[PDB]
Symmetry: C3
Subunit: 114 residues, 3 copies
């Protein structure tokens, strides 16, 4: 914070996503329902793209669900991870990769703004 | 209904998604499991694209989960939102934006139809 | 197994996704939490693309949730479906289409690997 998305890194050159970590240690329980985890990373995104925030497989399998997040091209706020403990108590340590940011083309349409 | 996707609007010019609302007031509880909410909006989609239906962040955080929906290019039926109340009772009012339609390129492959 | 993604088929020419089935009969219950279902299909993906694994609508509505899976371009391991029974006991029969693989462009950025 405030760090732009150009600071994020990829696990490998073939990686679809840029890695995202929480900036805090947090405990999640099933009865808590959706929590927004802070990353300290901020939009905006490169021209003509939007972002999709998704979980990592290994973290999903440990029972932390990441709800899909959509980041608009011109969003300048903080990117947060919407997360929920599925079945059991989950502990998120500062610095553990929890989610990934995937960049996709923004297709132009004639739909009206309103 | 029957309204085509060209009638949908974007929240802002930088918005990735086109907004979707339910046409009914509905109450959802956790024990109900997935429900298909009617939008009154119908495919098909623009040439060489498919649709992805996702939740909005603010609605996700109020404990209404939208399951990712895939809309094929040539689907002409009604777009519905697959939704579930996570932890608590959720009330959906007619007209409240619940989900978004994101348009993505349809990549061509040589995979067989069958 | 080991079958490449070129062996998968589409339901119809307009289908966004390539169909994925589990190679085993498996029962899932809500208390089990995320399970990785084997498909016997392996990466890698076509050049300049990544994969997104998502649920099918009809299966989502029968109470089997597929968590979004991201397949990197150069992944050569087995594609697995991360799945959970939502509310009730779900039975997956060998050969029933449970998920779909969607191919998307891999956008190039200057982000560092690390």
């Amino acid at each position: 914070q405030k760090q732009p998305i150009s600071k994020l890194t990829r696990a490998t050159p073939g990686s679809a996503g840029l890695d995202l970590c929480s900036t805090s240690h947090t405990v999640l329980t099933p009865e808590m329902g959706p929590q927004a985890l802070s990353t300290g990373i901020y939009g905006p995104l490169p021209p003509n793209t939007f972002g999709l925030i998704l979980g990592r497989s290994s973290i999903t399998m440990k029972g932390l669900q990441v709800y899909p997040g959509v980041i608009d091209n011109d969003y300048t706020g903080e990117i947060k991870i919407m997360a929920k403990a599925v079945n059991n108590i989950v502990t998120v340590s500062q610095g553990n990769r929890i989610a990934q940011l995937i960049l996709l083309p923004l297709i132009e349409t004639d739909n009206k703004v309103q």
